[PDB]
Amino acid sequence: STVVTTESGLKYEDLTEGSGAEARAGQTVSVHYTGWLTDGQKFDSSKDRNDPFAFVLGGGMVIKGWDEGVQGMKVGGVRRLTIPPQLGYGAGGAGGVIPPNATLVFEVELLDV
Amino acid sequence: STVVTTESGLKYEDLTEGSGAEARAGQTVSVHYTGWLTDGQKFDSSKDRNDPFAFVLGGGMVIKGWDEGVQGMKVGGVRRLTIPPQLGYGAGGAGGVIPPNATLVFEVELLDV
Numbered sequence: 135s136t137v138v139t140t141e142s143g144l145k146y147e148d149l150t151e152g153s154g155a156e157a158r159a160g161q162t163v164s165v166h167y168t169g170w171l172t173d174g175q176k177f178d179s180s181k182d183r184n185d186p187f188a189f190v191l192g193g194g195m196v197i198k199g200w201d202e203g204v205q206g207m208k209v210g211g212v213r214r215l216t217i218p219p220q221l222g223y224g225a226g227g228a229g230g231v232i233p234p235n236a237t238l239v240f241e242v243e244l245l246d247v
Numbered sequence: 248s249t250v251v252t253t254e255s256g257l258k259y260e261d262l263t264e265g266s267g268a269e270a271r272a273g274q275t276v277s278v279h280y281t282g283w284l285t286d287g288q289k290f291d292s293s294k295d296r297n298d299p300f301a302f303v304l305g306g307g308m309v310i311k312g313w314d315e316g317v318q319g320m321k322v323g324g325v326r327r328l329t330i331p332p333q334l335g336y337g338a339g340g341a342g343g344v345i346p347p348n349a350t351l352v353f354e355v356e357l358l359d360v
């Protein structure tokens with residue numbers, strides 16, 4: 135599989151190509167995800183909480199790297215997103231668990247569109 | 248299991264009580280469903296299309312019997328809704344497949360909240 139670096143500095147890699155319907159901005163999508171810091175510390179997993187995550191793709195409610203990175207996935211696909219801090223939580227960080235200026239690694243599995 | 252007739256004339260029956268989180272108005276929920284006319288003709292199944300259905304519970308986008316009937320389900324639950332036409336498609340019917348003045352029977356399985 136390839137690593138694509140977009141104009142924003144986002145990087146993504148389709149670990150598994152989906153065979154089902156394509157995700158586009160406007161759709162309400164459902165995913166499983168895991169999130170890690172670059173040192174390999176896991177900060178979240180929806181699979182561990184047994185709770186698929188739904189959001190409006192392109193809705194401006196999730197971090198920029200997600201609204202961008204999830205577009206183009208197909209249902210069944212697993213995509214790895216490497217999100218620079220300016221497309222994540224920036225200088226501010228989050229919840230005392232994501233530090234300032236953190237690059238974030240997510241693996242995202244698309245369950246439904 | 249019991250059959251509850253609500254103030255609106257909706258009837259519902261929890262065929263299977265869910266063990267997980269409760270559905271409330273405001274949440275984006277995901278369900279599988281099958282829909283039948285009272286004569287036993289199936290008009291739709293999201294399971295047959297392999298496509299869970301997401302909607303905003305209480306969002307005024309689905310027929311009245313759904314916005315009402317899905318509230319109170321728990322994740323894992325299967326509820327049967329018997330929807331009189333005034334809480335469904337009324338005198339107008341739908342898609343040439345649901346006739347005028349049709350009572351509708353849905354079985355709804357809650358997958359996520």
Ligand SMILES: C=CC[C@@H]1/C=C(\C)C[C@H](C)C[C@H](OC)[C@H]2O[C@@](O)(C(=O)C(=O)N3CCCC[C@H]3C(=O)O[C@H](/C(C)=C/[C@@H]3CC[C@@H](O)[C@H](OC)C3)[C@H](C)[C@@H](O)CC1=O)[C@H](C)C[C@@H]2OC
Pocket residue numbers: 167169177178187195196197200222223224228229232
């Ligand atoms: C309002 C009540 C809580 C409400 C919570 C939910 C619906 C439950 C939902 C599963 C979130 C998780 O709850 C277990 C948990 O997910 C993380 O662990 C995580 O993996 C993460 O990073 N995710 C979640 C998956 C999508 C990407 C990213 C996100 O974009 O999340 C969004 C996020 C935090 C955006 C910030 C918002 C503030 C801005 O200032 C900032 O702009 C820089 C961007 C989340 C979805 C918000 O839209 C909505 C909420 O927050 C966060 C590390 C902390 C977060 O808990 C808060």
Ligand SMILES: C=CC[C@@H]1/C=C(\C)C[C@H](C)C[C@H](OC)[C@H]2O[C@@](O)(C(=O)C(=O)N3CCCC[C@H]3C(=O)O[C@H](/C(C)=C/[C@@H]3CC[C@@H](O)[C@H](OC)C3)[C@H](C)[C@@H](O)CC1=O)[C@H](C)C[C@@H]2OC
Pocket residue numbers: 280282290291300308309310313335336337341342345
């Ligand atoms: C806009 C583009 C299409 C858009 C379609 C989708 C998102 C795909 C989604 C799976 C719908 C199904 O597509 C395969 C299909 O589901 C049925 O088969 C069905 O089982 C049904 O009855 N459902 C769907 C499940 C929730 C309850 C009910 C409904 O409330 O559905 C809603 C409905 C029709 C409401 C009418 C709207 C008009 C009002 O005038 C009327 O007020 C009386 C109420 C649907 C979800 C609308 O909100 C959105 C849409 O329609 C209909 C028999 C026909 C419908 O296809 C159209």
Ligand SMILES: [Ca+2]
Pocket residue numbers: 185186187188359360
């Ligand atoms: Ca969920």
Ligand SMILES: [Ca+2]
Pocket residue numbers: 246247298299300301
């Ligand atoms: Ca769907």
